[PDB]
Amino acid sequence: LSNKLTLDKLDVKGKRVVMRVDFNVPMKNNQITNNQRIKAAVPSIKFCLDNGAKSVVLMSHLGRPDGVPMPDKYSLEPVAVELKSLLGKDVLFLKDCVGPEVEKACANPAAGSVILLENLRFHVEEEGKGEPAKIEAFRASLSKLGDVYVNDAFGTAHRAHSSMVGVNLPQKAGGFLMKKELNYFAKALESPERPFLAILGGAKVADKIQLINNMLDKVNEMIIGGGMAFTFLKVLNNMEIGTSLFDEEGAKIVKDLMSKAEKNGVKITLPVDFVTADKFDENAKTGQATVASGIPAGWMGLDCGPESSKKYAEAVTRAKQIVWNGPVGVFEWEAFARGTKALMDEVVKATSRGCITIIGGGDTATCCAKWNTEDKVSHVSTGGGASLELLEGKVLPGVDALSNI
Numbered sequence: 210l211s212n213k214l215t216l217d218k219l220d221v222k223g224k225r226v227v228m229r230v231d232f233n234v235p236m237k238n239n240q241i242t243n244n245q246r247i248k249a250a251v252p253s254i255k256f257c258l259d260n261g262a263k264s265v266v267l268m269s270h271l272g273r274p275d276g277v278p279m280p281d282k283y284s285l286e287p288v289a290v291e292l293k294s295l296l297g298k299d300v301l302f303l304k305d306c307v308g309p310e311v312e313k314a315c316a317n318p319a320a321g322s323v324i325l326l327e328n329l330r331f332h333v334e335e336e337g338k339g340e341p342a343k344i345e346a347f348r349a350s351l352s353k354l355g356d357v358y359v360n361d362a363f364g365t366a367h368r369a370h371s372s373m374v375g376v377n378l379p380q381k382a383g384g385f386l387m388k389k390e391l392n393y394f395a396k397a398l399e400s401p402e403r404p405f406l407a408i409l410g411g412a413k414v415a416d417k418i419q420l421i422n423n424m425l426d427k428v429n430e431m432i433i434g435g436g437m438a439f440t441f442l443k444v445l446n447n448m449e450i451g452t453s454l455f456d457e458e459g460a461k462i463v464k465d466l467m468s469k470a471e472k473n474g475v476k477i478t479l480p481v482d483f484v485t486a487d488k489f490d491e492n493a494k495t496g497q498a499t500v501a502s503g504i505p506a507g508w509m510g511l512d513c514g515p516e517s518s519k520k521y522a523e524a525v526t527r528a529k530q531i532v533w534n535g536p537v538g539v540f541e542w543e544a545f546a547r548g549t550k551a552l553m554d555e556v557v558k559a560t561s562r563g564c565i566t567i568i569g570g571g572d573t574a575t576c577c578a579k580w581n582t583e584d585k586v587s588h589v590s591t592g593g594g595a596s597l598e599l600l601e602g603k604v605l606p607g608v609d610a611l612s613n614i
């Protein structure tokens with residue numbers, strides 16, 4: 210951020226600070242399962258308060274409510290409560306993020322007020338799809354909630370959304386988490402140790418399959434696992450995949466990706482076996498499948514199997530540097546957690562013999578919390594797709610929108 214205003218040089222004394230954070234925390238049975246992303250923004254928030262900010266107004270999305278208010282499923286209210294404990298200051302939660310009543314609560318707050326707005330994506334104008342004059346007015350309304358803007362939302366920095374690129378105030382500063390994450394990656398990605406392995410799993414198939422093309426110019430090996438694999442196996446193996454995650458658009462580029470991997474000497478490791486489920490439920494009935502057998506109609510692959518785990522371990526053993534985003538199964542549910550656990554064990558072992566290991570993402574970082582490996586890998590990042598976009602070599606929209614120095 211040499212070229213960009215950062216919080217360390219932003220005068221906040223007597224200023225209302227409006228701050229985009231990534232508080233898109235994982236949830237389960239209505240409770241936060243990992244407060245990593247909330248803790249990560251505390252240094253910027255504390256800094257503002259300690260240096261005399263009149264207020265800090267915090268704004269984030271949570272999940273993908275698709276521009277419709279969904280307070281029953283995707284409310285940020287629970288975050289406010291967790292933020293109080295972490296901060297040592299109370300936080301006011303507002304039930305919306307714009308305009309008239311929110312604008313009043315933020316216009317002239319009591320000194321030192323911390324305020325958390327409701328889910329930005331309850332409004333279509335944040336993304337805005339899921340409408341030009343209304344997008345302008347959405348952005349104008351957010352711009353009113355402070356005098357200066359800070360973006361500490363590393364995990365969302367790849368998104369050119371209204372709250373990330375559309376705030377119109379004279380001073381737009383990168384926060385300390387943004388700086389910490391960009392600095393770590395700049396160093397780690399400058400001259401990666403080789404072989405450099407990327408591990409891509411998870412469930413955001415439509416988005417993340419589109420990142421593979423550029424990643425293939427940077428890495429020497431790739432594991433394509435979790436939800437990502439089924440699109441590849443259907444196209445390449447003509448495998449029956451039941452109701453497993455499948456991306457129609459990405460299917461159309463799978464063969465081109467494999468050609469480019471061959472051209473670039475990138476070894477691709479796909480799973481060869483699976484733990485299956487009769488429905489998307491923690492208590493689903495379960496089965497086993499292989500690529501040869503296919504997955505039965507109406508069943509889904511929710512974890513890889515033992516032979517896949519062995520192949521993954523073999524790639525990890527070869528690697529001198531690893532970036533991992535996306536669990537290789539539905540590790541939140543114990544019936545589908547073994548593959549991710551096994552891969553985590555191998556990544557920890559790699560770290561202990563000198564592998565540089567970077568694990569990132571809202572959900573993938575939760576694997577580290579779940580198995581107590583946050584201090585047994587080289588770096589745990591608050592960015593998932595955001596990190597993958599850095600690996601591709603892009604400038605992130607949330608960074609690009611900051612004020613030049």
Ligand SMILES: Nc1ncnc2c1ncn2[C@@H]1O[C@H](COP(=O)(O)OP(=O)(O)O)[C@@H](O)[C@H]1O
Pocket residue numbers: 410411412413434435436437454510511512534535536537538539540541569570571572573574592593594
């Ligand atoms: N085979 C699969 N089918 C469906 N979901 C999966 C599968 N494998 C992994 N997942 C899911 O991937 C989700 C995380 O993916 P993602 O959101 O892209 O990663 P992150 O939050 O680290 O960026 C987890 O919630 C996990 O349950």
Ligand SMILES: [Br-]
Pocket residue numbers: 412413414415416417
């Ligand atoms: Br997606």
Ligand SMILES: [Mg+2]
Pocket residue numbers: 570571572573593
């Ligand atoms: Mg996620």
